[PDB]
Write a protein that binds this DNA or RNA. Structure first.
Lengths: 79, 99, 48, 50, 376
DNA sequence: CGTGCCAATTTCT
DNA sequence: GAAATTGGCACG
C-alpha cells in the first residue's frame, strides 16, 4: 500500500491534476486491457497508477501521446 | 369613470356608490373584488406612464419623493423589458400538483 | 448515493461488474422543487 | 452553541463562490503591514503578519 | 491620567500643534496629537494619544529613559489655552444676558460663569461671548504666522478662570468645561451603526459655528482652497469637541465615540476600513488565545465591498441613482477608457454579511439562504 | 410643501 | 426578544 503521495504531487506539480491523471490511468488499467508499467505487488489500480506517476512513467503528455499512437495504429490495422 | 367628477382610483362605499349611481348614469363604472383590480391592471399603459414618471422625476426637485418615484420607474421598466404583463398577477386558472 | 433514481441502479450494476464509474444524472428532489414552484403560478424552467 | 453556528452559516453564505482563478492580476498596490502597538506593548511582531 | 513611558528611547510627535507656555514647557493645541517612542534602530514601540491642551515635559526628538512622566494633563478640565502672551480684554459679554455671577462659598476663587443659549436670555442668544487677548498697548496680538487676531469664543457652561485684565500667556486656560465577545464580532461583520456614532466632518479647512437651535446646531466649513458652502447639521445636546477657531482636516471627528464603518469607508477610503475591521476582530480573538491568519478576515472584507452606487449616469448605460455590481462598473469603464470614450463614476458601498449575501446575481443561490418568498 | 421622529409589521435565531 | 423596513404624524 502507501501512506503519502508527496512524490507524485511533486512530479505532477498540482494536487488537483494528480487525481485526474491517476484516475485516467487507473481506469485504463481496470476496465481496459492495459497492464501496469511497474511490478504490481498485490496492489489495486489506484495505487499502481500512483506508483507509476511517482517514477516519471505516466503524465498527461505521455497518456495523450500513447492514445494518439494507439488510435493511429488501430486505424491503420482496420484498413 | 371619466374625467368628469370622479377619479380612476377613487374608493366608494355602499351609500357613496348609491349617490354616484344617482349622479352618473353612463360613463361611470364601479366594481369590487379581483375583477376591479384586473380591470385596473389591464387598462394601464406602461410606456406613457413611464414617460410621465420620468418627466415628473427630472422636473420637480425633492429627495424622498424622488426615491419613491425611482422605486416605481424601476418596476415599470422591469415589467416592460421582460415579457410579463401586469394582469397576470390575478389568477384565472389554478395549477394543481401531480398526485 | 442519495437521489438520482436512474443512477443508483447503474452504479450498483457497475460495482457488481467490477467497473467503478458513475453516470451522474439529475437528482429527483429538484424536479419536485420545480413542480412545487410552478404550481404557485410561477413559470420556472430549464433552458438550452 | 447556536450563535456561533448562525454566524458561521452567514459567513459561508456571504463568501461561498470566491475561488483562486488566476496567477497574477498585474497590479502591485496593497496594504502596509505594521506591527500592532496598543501603546505599551507590541502585541504581535512583524514576523507573523508577513 | 498621564503618560508614563516604560522603556528608553526617543520621543516623537505626530500631528501636533504646540507652543511654549509661560513656564517654559510645551502645551498642545491639536486634538489629533500622537506620541511615539523610537529606539536606536529606528523602530516604534509605543503609541499614545495626547488630548487637547496637555503639558509636555519633553520636546520632539529629545532623549528620555525608563519610567519618566513625559506628558501630563487635566482630564476633567478642557482648556482654552492661548498661543500669544498679553492681558485680557472682555468683548461682548453682558451679565444677565450672556453670562452669570456665581461665587464659591468656601474657596472664594470666583469669576463670571458663561451661560448657555438654552438658559440665557434671548437678547444674549445672538451675541457671542468671546475672550480677546491684548497687549500692554491695548492692541490685539495676532497669532504668529497668521492674520486673524486672537479672539476665542466660548460655549455654554464655560467657567472663566481669572477676571478681566489679568496678565496671561500660553498655558493658561481661559475657561473650564466639565465633561465584547461573540456579539462584538457578529456586529463588526454585519456593519451595524452604534448607539451614538462619532459624528465626522466631510471636508478640511477652517471651521466655525452657524445658526443655533433650528432643531439642532449647524456647522460651517471653509476650505483654504476648496468650496465652502457645505453646511452640516450637528446635534448640540451631546458634548461636542469641534474647535471653531482652528483649522481641521477632513478625516477628523467632531463628537467622540464608536465610529460606524460606513462613515469610515465614505470619508477615509477602503484601506482604512480593511485595517479597522481586521484589527477590531483580531483584538476580540487575540485576548482569548485564538490564532487566526489575516487573509481570512480580508477576504470577508472584500466580499463586503461588492456593490457600488452611481452618482452620475455618464456616457454609459447605467441610470443616475441605481446600485450595481462593482465588477460590471469596472469592466464597462475599462472598455471605454481603452476606447476613445470616457466612463462613469461610482461610489463604494459597505454591507453586512446578511445583506451582501442576499443581494447576489443568482436567485437559486439567494432563495436557499433565507427569505425565499421575497426573492422568488 | 419638505424632514424627521414614532408606531406597526415582518423575519430571524 | 432584536433588528430593519414602512406608513403615519408633528413640525418648520
Amino acid at each position: 500500500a502507501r501512506v503519502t503521495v508527496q512524490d507524485a504531487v511533486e512530479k505532477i506539480g498540482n494536487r488537483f491534476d494528480l487525481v485526474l491523471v491517476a484516475a485516467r490511468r487507473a481506469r485504463q488499467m481496470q476496465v481496459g486491457g492495459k497492464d501496469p508499467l511497474v511490478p504490481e505487488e498485490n496492489d489495486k489500480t489506484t495505487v499502481i497508477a500512483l506508483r507509476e506517476i511517482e517514477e516519471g512513467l505516466i503524465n498527461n503528455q505521455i497518456l495523450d501521446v500513447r492514445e494518439r499512437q494507439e488510435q493511429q495504429e488501430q486505424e491503420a490495422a482496420e484498413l | 369613470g371619466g374625467m368628469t367628477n370622479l377619479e380612476r382610483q377613487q374608493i366608494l362605499t355602499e351609500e357613496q356608490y348609491l349617490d354616484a349611481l344617482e349622479e352618473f348614469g353612463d360613463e361611470f363604472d364601479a366594481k369590487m373584488g379581483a375583477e376591479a383590480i384586473q380591470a385596473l391592471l389591464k387598462s394601464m399603459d406602461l410606456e406613457q406612464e413611464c414617460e410621465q414618471l420620468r418627466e415628473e422625476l427630472n422636473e420637480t426637485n425633492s429627495e424622498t419623493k424622488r426615491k419613491k418615484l425611482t422605486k416605481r420607474i424601476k418596476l415599470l421598466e422591469a415589467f416592460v423589458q421582460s415579457g410579463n404583463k401586469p394582469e397576470w398577477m390575478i389568477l384565472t386558472v389554478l395549477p394543481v400538483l401531480p398526485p | 448515493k442519495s437521489d438520482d433514481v436512474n443512477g443508483r441502479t447503474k452504479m450498483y450494476k457497475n460495482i457488481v461488474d467490477g467497473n467503478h464509474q458513475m453516470e451522474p444524472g439529475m437528482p429527483e428532489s429538484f424536479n419536485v422543487l420545480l413542480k412545487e414552484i410552478r404550481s404557485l403560478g410561477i413559470n420556472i424552467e430549464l433552458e438550452d | 452553541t447556536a450563535n456561533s453556528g448562525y454566524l458561521t452559516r452567514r459567513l459561508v453564505d456571504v463568501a461561498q463562490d470566491l475561488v483562486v482563478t488566476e496567477d497574477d492580476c498585474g497590479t502591485h498596490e496593497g496594504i502596509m503591514m505594521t506591527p500592532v502597538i496598543e501603546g505599551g506593548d507590541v502585541k504581535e511582531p512583524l514576523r507573523d503578519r508577513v | 491620567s498621564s503618560i508614563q513611558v516604560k522603556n528608553k528611547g526617543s520621543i516623537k510627535l505626530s500631528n501636533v500643534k504646540s507652543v511654549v507656555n509661560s513656564s517654559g514647557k510645551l502645551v498642545i493645541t491639536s486634538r489629533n496629537t500622537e506620541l511615539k517612542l523610537i529606539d536606536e534602530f529606528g523602530r516604534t514601540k509605543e503609541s499614545y494619544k495626547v488630548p487637547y491642551g496637555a503639558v509636555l515635559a519633553k520636546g520632539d526628538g529629545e532623549q528620555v529613559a525608563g519610567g519618566e512622566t513625559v506628558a501630563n494633563w487635566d482630564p476633567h478640565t478642557m482648556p482654552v489655552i492661548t498661543e500669544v502672551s498679553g492681558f485680557v480684554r472682555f468683548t461682548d459679554m453682558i451679565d444677565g444676558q450672556t453670562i452669570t455671577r456665581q461665587t464659591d462659598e468656601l474657596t472664594g476663587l470666583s469669576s463670571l460663569v458663561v451661560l448657555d443659549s438654552a438658559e440665557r436670555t434671548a437678547g444674549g442668544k445672538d451675541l457671542r461671548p468671546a475672550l480677546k487677548i491684548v497687549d500692554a498697548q491695548g492692541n490685539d496680538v495676532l497669532i504668529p504666522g497668521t492674520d486673524m487676531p486672537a479672539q476665542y469664543f466660548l460655549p455654554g457652561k464655560a467657567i472663566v478662570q481669572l477676571e478681566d485684565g489679568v496678565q496671561i500667556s500660553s498655558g493658561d486656560t481661559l475657561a473650564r468645561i466639565p465633561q465584547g465577545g461573540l456579539p462584538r464580532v457578529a456586529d463588526l461583520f454585519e456593519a451595524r451603526r452604534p448607539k451614538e456614532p462619532a459624528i465626522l466632518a466631510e471636508i478640511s479647512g477652517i471651521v466655525s459655528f452657524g445658526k443655533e437651535t433650528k432643531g439642532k446646531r449647524r456647522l460651517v466649513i471653509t476650505p483654504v482652497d476648496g468650496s465652502d458652502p457645505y453646511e452640516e447639521m450637528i446635534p448640540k445636546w451631546r458634548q461636542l469637541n469641534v474647535f471653531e477657531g482652528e483649522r481641521v482636516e477632513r478625516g477628523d471627528v467632531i463628537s467622540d465615540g464608536p465610529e460606524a464603518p460606513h462613515d469610515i469607508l465614505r470619508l477615509r477610503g477602503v484601506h482604512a476600513v480593511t485595517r479597522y475591521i481586521v484589527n477590531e476582530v483580531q483584538d476580540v480573538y487575540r485576548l482569548q488565545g485564538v490564532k487566526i491568519n489575516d487573509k481570512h478576515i480580508e477576504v470577508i472584507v472584500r466580499q463586503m465591498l461588492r456593490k457600488a452606487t452611481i452618482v452620475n449616469a455618464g456616457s454609459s448605460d447605467f441610470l443616475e441613482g441605481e446600485q450595481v455590481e462593482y465588477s460590471r462598473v469596472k469592466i464597462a469603464n475599462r472598455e471605454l477608457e481603452a476606447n476613445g470614450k470616457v466612463g462613469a463614476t461610482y461610489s463604494r458601498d459597505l454591507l453586512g454579511i446578511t445583506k451582501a449575501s442576499l443581494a447576489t446575481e443568482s436567485f437559486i443561490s439567494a432563495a436557499s439562504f433565507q427569505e425565499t418568498t421575497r426573492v422568488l
